[PDB]
Enzyme design. Structure first.
Site, PDB file in Angstrom:
ATOM      1  N   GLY A 135       0.820  -1.242   0.000  1.00  0.00           N
ATOM      2  CA  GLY A 135       0.000   0.000   0.000  1.00  0.00           C
ATOM      3  C   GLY A 135       0.841   1.274   0.000  1.00  0.00           C
ATOM      4  O   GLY A 135       1.983   1.275   0.476  1.00  0.00           O
ATOM      5  N   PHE A 145       0.758   9.434   3.505  1.00  0.00           N
ATOM      6  CA  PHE A 145       1.689   9.487   4.635  1.00  0.00           C
ATOM      7  C   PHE A 145       2.772   8.419   4.641  1.00  0.00           C
ATOM      8  O   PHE A 145       3.531   8.304   5.600  1.00  0.00           O
ATOM      9  CB  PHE A 145       0.897   9.440   5.934  1.00  0.00           C
ATOM     10  N   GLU A 186       4.150   4.258   2.941  1.00  0.00           N
ATOM     11  CA  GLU A 186       3.918   2.974   2.285  1.00  0.00           C
ATOM     12  C   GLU A 186       3.886   1.842   3.329  1.00  0.00           C
ATOM     13  O   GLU A 186       4.393   2.003   4.434  1.00  0.00           O
ATOM     14  CB  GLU A 186       5.022   2.716   1.239  1.00  0.00           C
ATOM     15  N   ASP A 199     -11.145   3.141  15.596  1.00  0.00           N
ATOM     16  CA  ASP A 199     -11.076   2.906  14.153  1.00  0.00           C
ATOM     17  C   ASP A 199     -11.369   1.443  13.858  1.00  0.00           C
ATOM     18  O   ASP A 199     -10.774   0.857  12.950  1.00  0.00           O
ATOM     19  CB  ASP A 199      -9.705   3.351  13.619  1.00  0.00           C
TER      20      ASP A 199
HETATM   21 CL1  LIG Z   1       3.207  -2.377   9.436  1.00  0.00          CL
HETATM   22  C1  LIG Z   1       2.089  -1.836  10.737  1.00  0.00           C
HETATM   23  C2  LIG Z   1       2.292  -0.626  11.411  1.00  0.00           C
HETATM   24  C3  LIG Z   1       1.397  -0.251  12.427  1.00  0.00           C
HETATM   25  C4  LIG Z   1       0.335  -1.093  12.781  1.00  0.00           C
HETATM   26  C5  LIG Z   1       0.098  -2.318  12.143  1.00  0.00           C
HETATM   27  C6  LIG Z   1       0.958  -2.732  11.123  1.00  0.00           C
HETATM   28  N1  LIG Z   1       0.772  -3.916  10.458  1.00  0.00           N
HETATM   29  C7  LIG Z   1       0.279  -4.036   9.172  1.00  0.00           C
HETATM   30  N2  LIG Z   1      -0.328  -3.017   8.524  1.00  0.00           N
HETATM   31  C8  LIG Z   1      -0.808  -3.169   7.283  1.00  0.00           C
HETATM   32  C9  LIG Z   1      -0.739  -4.343   6.560  1.00  0.00           C
HETATM   33  C10 LIG Z   1      -1.340  -4.324   5.169  1.00  0.00           C
HETATM   34  C11 LIG Z   1      -1.225  -3.155   4.372  1.00  0.00           C
HETATM   35  C12 LIG Z   1      -1.795  -3.069   3.082  1.00  0.00           C
HETATM   36  C13 LIG Z   1      -2.508  -4.170   2.589  1.00  0.00           C
HETATM   37  C14 LIG Z   1      -2.665  -5.328   3.392  1.00  0.00           C
HETATM   38  C15 LIG Z   1      -2.080  -5.402   4.668  1.00  0.00           C
HETATM   39  N3  LIG Z   1      -0.160  -5.420   7.151  1.00  0.00           N
HETATM   40  C16 LIG Z   1       0.062  -6.666   6.715  1.00  0.00           C
HETATM   41  N4  LIG Z   1       0.679  -7.373   7.679  1.00  0.00           N
HETATM   42  C17 LIG Z   1       0.883  -6.599   8.760  1.00  0.00           C
HETATM   43  C18 LIG Z   1       0.350  -5.318   8.412  1.00  0.00           C
END
Ligand SMILES: Clc1ccccc1Nc1ncc(-c2ccccc2)n2cncc12
Length: 271
Positions: free
Chosen positions: A22, A26, A28, A134
């Protein structure tokens, strides 16, 4: 603790960003590897787009809320570009998962199972004196084994005195957010309970928009009359009545998350 004493700080070298999941205003989110072997998600901050203190605030809160049912903080990199590294969730967001060929084939039993898992997560958040704010199918992530975890803690807050009050300006998704939070900016764990009811509709409709065919002003008008969302197609009536408890007028009449977890496991082990 400073970065040189912080057990969560990792050298940027430990990480390899493999596939972008994604991109927004803000930053990726990437799938990558930590130390070659361990699959991780990496959220990166786009410099200047927002405060790094504000970005890192989500990681600091996650340091305090660790549970199997909540996406786990792994590490931070606190030099630009700032990273938050977490547990990787192989099947992505629930809202997206429910639409895939595998999501489509899930029985009501498995749906009720996943609902219970989410409530169990929220029950931990509730016990710890936090609110989420949220809570929605987009912010539940799905594992390779089809277990569910709460994610996106950006609006999440440790509660002082049961109530967080947002600023007069602040806006929130109308269809997911409890009337008292839209109207007064006041959030409680009972605001989240309301959001949970809406999330249950997303589960049973495989990720359809709540209040089908209705604008925000229409949702508000209907709610004030005492109507609630029309029974989704193929919603078991027991689940619908459980939704209605989440949508009680008085926040204090809304059930606890422990209660919701309990009932959903009963629904599951009965189907
Ligand atoms: Cl990386 C992060 C920072 C702060 C809070 C939660 C997460 N974890 C995740 N966020 C988004 C996705 C994600 C983003 C886009 C599409 C699908 C999943 N994801 C997949 N595995 C762990 C995370």
């Amino acid at each position: 603790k400073p970065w040189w004493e912080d057990e969560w700080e990792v050298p940027r070298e430990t990480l390899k960003l493999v596939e972008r999941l994604g991109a927004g205003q803000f930053g990726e989110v990437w799938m990558g590897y930590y130390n070659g072997h361990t699959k991780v998600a990496v959220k990166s901050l786009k410099q200047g787009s927002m405060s790094p203190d504000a970005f890192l605030a989500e990681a600091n809160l996650m340091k305090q809320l660790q549970h199997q049912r909540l996406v786990r903080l792994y590490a931070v990199v606190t030099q630009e570009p700032i990273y938050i590294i977490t547990e990787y969730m192989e099947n992505g967001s629930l809202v997206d998962f429910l639409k895939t060929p595998s999501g489509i084939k899930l029985t009501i039993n498995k749906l009720l199972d996943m609902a219970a898992q989410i409530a169990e997560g929220m029950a931990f958040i509730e016990e710890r004196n936090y609110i989420h704010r949220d809570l929605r199918a987009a912010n539940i992530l799905v594992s390779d084994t089809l277990s569910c975890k709460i994610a996106d803690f950006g609006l999440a807050r440790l509660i002082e005195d049961n109530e967080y009050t947002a600023r007069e300006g602040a806006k929130f998704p109308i269809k997911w957010t409890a009337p008292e939070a839209i109207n007064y900016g006041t959030f409680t764990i009972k605001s989240d309970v309301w959001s949970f009811g809406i999330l249950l509709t997303e589960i049973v409709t495989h990720g359809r928009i709540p209040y089908p065919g209705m604008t925000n002003p229409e949702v508000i008008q209907n709610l004030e009359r005492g109507y609630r969302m029309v029974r989704p197609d193929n919603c078991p009536e027991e689940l619908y009545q459980l939704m209605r408890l989440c949508w009680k007028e008085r926040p204090e009449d809304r059930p606890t998350f422990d209660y919701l977890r309990s009932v959903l496991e009963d629904f599951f082990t009965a189907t």
